[PDB]
């Protein structure tokens, strides 16, 4: 039976009874940095159980007219346990991820969600002379939401959250070139993505740069008949893999 999985990382375990396959990045599994690719000369820290475990964010509610949500991935885990504590004391860090999006509904519901993972998702602003602010690019483990309409310009340097351009100026149907899965409520219950470390440098500062972005977009809207449960949540659970840190100094933020 291909329908069951079990993922164990640290002191946490994920159990799934109805799933698709597991998507592994670009075919690469996350591993540690080698000696011929390293730059910094001091010894890196490897906590290996206090950081590499499953953290669960807040839950969002899927509605009949909902548009989509997104997260910035080395920013939602910035107050999460000892993963966020090692980010504040160190200057460099590299990390791969295991993302588990989960959403259950009955055989009487329908809908379809696309779960992509976009690297270097640089977004646009509503005022064309400015760039968006940090508070509207990312929340602290809280989803920022796409809109079904076009956002106008103001003094808040907002993101153009028209969902069909995906905040980047592209076609939203062409988002399947990134590592992705679907959650079809007819057949699927969860989605699992394992991402390696993707950058143009072997290590990078984990506060001034978000090199991954998790988008969840309902291509087919949620629908049910009267009598079925109206409240359907979506829960995201992310686990760091092979996280190491370098450049220990006093605590930022």
């Amino acid at each position: 039976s291909d329908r069951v999985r079990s993922i164990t990382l640290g002191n946490s375990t994920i159990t799934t009874q109805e799933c698709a396959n597991v998507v592994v990045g670009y075919g690469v599994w996350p591993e540690y940095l080698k000696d011929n690719e390293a730059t910094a000369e001091d010894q890196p820290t490897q906590p290996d159980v206090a950081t590499c475990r499953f953290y669960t964010l807040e839950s969002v509610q899927w509605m009949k007219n909902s548009a989509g949500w997104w997260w910035k991935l080395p920013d939602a885990l910035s107050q999460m346990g000892l993963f966020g504590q090692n980010m504040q004391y160190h200057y460099l860090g590299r990390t791969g991820y295991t993302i588990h999006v989960q959403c259950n509904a009955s055989k009487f519901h329908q809908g379809c969600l696309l779960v992509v993972c976009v690297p270097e998702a640089e977004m646009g602003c509503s005022n064309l002379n400015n760039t968006p602010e940090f508070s509207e690019l990312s929340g602290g483990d809280s989803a920022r939401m796409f809109t079904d309409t076009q956002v106008g310009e103001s003094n808040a340097k907002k993101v153009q959250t028209a969902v069909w351009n995906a905040g980047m100026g592209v076609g939203v149907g062409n988002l399947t070139i990134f590592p992705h899965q679907w959650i079809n409520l007819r057949t699927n219950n969860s989605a699992t993505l394992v991402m390696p470390y993707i950058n143009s440098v072997p290590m990078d500062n984990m506060f001034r740069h978000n090199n991954l972005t998790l988008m969840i977009i309902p291509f087919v809207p949620l629908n049910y008949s009267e009598g079925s449960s109206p409240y359907v949540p979506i829960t995201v659970t992310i686990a760091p893999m092979c996280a190491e840190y370098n450049g220990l100094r006093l605590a930022s933020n």
Epitope: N65, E136, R144, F146, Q150, G152, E153, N155, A156, K157
Partner: antibody
């Protein structure tokens, strides 16, 4: 969850500054912004300003100079100030939160504080 | 700036009647529109946002229709809980401008 409420001076003299404080609960000010709307008997509803979730403001063009809104995220309280208080300012003032699923509409309103500017 | 014209000013209907209230803008707001309901001497309540979407606790008798510069609300079957003032507001760009108002009678 539960939502916000406000507190006010009630009634003051003409050409005196006004200070009404909205204290929020159930949500954080780093995720949502606060709008200031004025329900007038002769002029209906009118929008005075907004303090955005990042900390930047936006004011009405008729009331730009006299109006100033600040906030402090740790105390979960919003403070705005309006000056010179003419006779047409007799109305009911509301504080209401926006960013209703990202759609910039007012979600939940305060209880309102009716003011009177006469001697 | 941009002004929202609300029509009509007042209506007189009965329980079980269909009510249509419209709003018109000076220029295109790209369906950045909200609707509010105000009862006797209280705070307004958000009812319909984004020119089609319904609010949290709002029942399915209300309906939002419109695009461009022409928008409309429809109430299918009236109840005793629905009379009062109805406003339309755009949140496209500052300055945000409310509608003039429309009151219901239920004679």
């Amino acid at each position: 969850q539960v939502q916000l409420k406000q507190s006010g001076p009630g009634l003051v003299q003409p050409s005196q500054s006004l200070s009404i404080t909205c204290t929020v609960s159930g949500f954080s000010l780093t995720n949502y912004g606060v709008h200031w709307v004025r329900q007038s008997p002769g002029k209906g509803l009118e929008w005075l300003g907004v303090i955005w979730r990042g900390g930047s403001t936006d004011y009405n063009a008729a009331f730009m100079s006299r109006l100033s809104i600040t906030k402090d995220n740790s105390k979960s309280q919003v403070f705005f100030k309006m000056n010179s208080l003419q006779a047409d300012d007799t109305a009911i003032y509301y504080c209401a939160k926006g960013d209703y699923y990202g759609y910039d509409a007012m979600d939940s309103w305060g209880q309102g504080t009716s003011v009177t500017v006469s001697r | 700036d941009i002004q929202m014209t609300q029509s009509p000013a007042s209506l007189s209907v009965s329980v079980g009647e269909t009510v249509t209230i419209t709003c018109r803008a000076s220029e295109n707001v790209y369906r950045n529109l909200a609707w509010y309901q105000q009862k006797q001497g209280k705070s307004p309540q958000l009812l319909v946002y984004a020119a089609t979407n319904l609010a949290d606790g709002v029942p399915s008798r209300f309906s939002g229709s419109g695009s461009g510069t022409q928008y409309s609300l429809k109430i299918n079957s009236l109840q005793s809980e629905d009379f009062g003032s109805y406003f339309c507001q755009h949140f496209w760009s500052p300055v945000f401008t409310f509608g003039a108002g429309t009151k219901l009678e239920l004679k």
